Design a protein around this ligand. Structure first.
Ligand SMILES: COc1cccc2[nH]c(C(=O)N[C@@H](CC(C)C)C(=O)N[C@@H](C[C@@H]3CCNC3=O)C(=O)COP(=O)(O)O)cc12
Lengths: 296, 296
């Protein structure tokens, strides 16, 4: 069982480079608009406590340079929406896929196309953590890289990268410029809340282990949603809801293991440990596969 | 630190569907040739003891249905090269990237674009194991899916998927149709030899931990090369050769840690485990990043 990313071709054709002064980062070119982090309009100085409204009002179109490969795109208008800059350009991107902008919830997964200087470098799969950060791999120059899901030819864009927190995790916005998590686009140290484990995803991953012939952690027992949530709190696991249980029904139907029976399995792994044994080749309980991810 | 795949768009534009009789799998359309596994020509029986020369001479060009999306491609010739069938078609692929064919060695990494009926489904990064298998995720119609690296916009095709082994691992060929390892495109009692850890990759990843600000696993010991190998082989680690030591030279000079000093650390890590810690994001010693992967 491998973590898989979506094929990135539809998004690769949308990545451009945006430069404002000496600040450069990635942008998303869809039809005749380029989307990118508003903090591109900042110098290192403004970055400590910028006034974005003021910094933008004194910019004109000629302050933005947009490069799609070896072609300059002429900016003919500019606008801000929340923390995202919108540069209207000369030309419609002829490679624009069918797409929509969506906001995801913690525990959901998506693919990230990591880009540098407007050039796609790699793709990886990740999950939005309960504390709204991303455990990603982003270096300097990665801002404006996007996250996405694909459903039958339609790209659902859900994330644009803005910043790295001191603990090495990552923070960003949706494509309408709304931050995930209690973070602001400023050059300051900001700490994420204590992260927790995505319980419904661990259960999904145990179903995939059963589906793949690993059965040793199964037992005869059941637990209650109430008493599982008690052990959940103790080990910093997200509380399990009746909504989660209904989501795992298709895997409970497919394998004959009721969710609270699987919770009994998970309760014992949390206390007793793995006995040194292994599940899907993992020493830790994996929590970045959703139920949907497993059934596919 | 994430295991990143290469952006897959340049390969997505080459994936097609090949049907001969009742068997369908994936093909790779480059210029005016479609490459696919030769067992596309096998019927239900066939697979136990196929005589590919005799099965192929009975075929006409029109027995091969090739579909690139909704477009049917006209086959105008065919031949067999080792274990891959090469279908000459009417039309050069307009989306053909710069490419080459390479044969890789155990320990090398690459990306796989998993495909079903010629449509890309997911992309993941992996390594050729020392026993010449792949720990992949391949469902029923994934034969003909390919593995690749991308360097300076040139796609190096190194792997084509042919078989699944009873352990759940995968076997295939280079793009000249020669199998990796001792396997055959025949449904016999073949299993992979015992698998081992790629030692030079573990050491690269430890050097990557030092560069990302981790030093907790270092110690004050060194080791001779032979003593290191005598110990590591007791944990099913591949022997470390003088070539592997030379290869880690640049990472040694950068971090200031001599290669045999890192070997002493690895000996201690194998003896002790992690003691509830993680090195990058793993409670496991990771062996699917190369010295080349780490430098970037
Ligand atoms: C006091 O300050 C701090 C203290 C402690 C931790 C801190 N972290 C950040 C931060 O993350 N700052 C944003 C910019 C602000 C305006 C939101 C940033 O730097 N984002 C990067 C990607 C980053 C770079 C490395 N890995 C990434 O993910 C871009 O891509 C654009 O910047 P570049 O033009 O590439 O340098 C500031 C800070």
């Amino acid at each position: 069982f491998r973590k898989m990313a979506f094929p990135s071709g539809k998004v690769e054709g949308c990545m451009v480079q945006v430069t404002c002064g000496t600040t450069t980062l990635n942008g998303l070119w869809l039809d005749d608009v380029v989307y990118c982090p508003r903090h591109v309009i900042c110098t290192s100085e403004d970055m400590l406590n910028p006034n974005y409204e003021d910094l933008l009002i004194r910019k004109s179109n000629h302050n933005f340079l947009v490069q799609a490969g070896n072609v300059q795109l002429r900016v003919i208008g500019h606008s801000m929406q929340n923390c995202v800059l919108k540069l209207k350009v000369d030309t419609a991107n002829p490679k624009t896929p069918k797409y929509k902008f969506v906001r995801i919830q913690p525990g959901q997964t998506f693919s990230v196309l990591a880009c540098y200087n407007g050039s796609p470098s790699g793709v990886y799969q990740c999950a939005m953590r309960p504390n709204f950060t991303i455990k990603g791999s982003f270096l300097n120059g990665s801002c404006g890289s996007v996250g996405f899901n694909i459903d039958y030819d339609c790209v659902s864009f859900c994330y644009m990268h803005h910043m790295e927190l001191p603990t090495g995790v990552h923070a960003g916005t949706d494509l309408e410029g709304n931050f995930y998590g209690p973070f602001v686009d400023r050059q300051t140290a900001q700490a994420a809340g204590t992260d927790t484990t995505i319980t419904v995803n661990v259960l999904a991953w145990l179903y995939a282990a059963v589906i793949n012939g690993d059965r040793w952690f199964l037992n005869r027992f059941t637990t209650t949603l109430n008493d599982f949530n008690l052990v959940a709190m103790k080990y910093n696991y997200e509380p399990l809801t009746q909504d989660h249980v209904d989501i795992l029904g298709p895997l409970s139907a497919q394998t004959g293991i009721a969710v609270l029976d699987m919770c009994a399995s998970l309760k014992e792994l949390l206390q007793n440990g793995m006995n040194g044994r292994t599940i899907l080749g993992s020493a830790l309980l994996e929590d970045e596969f959703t139920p949907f991810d497993v059934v596919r």
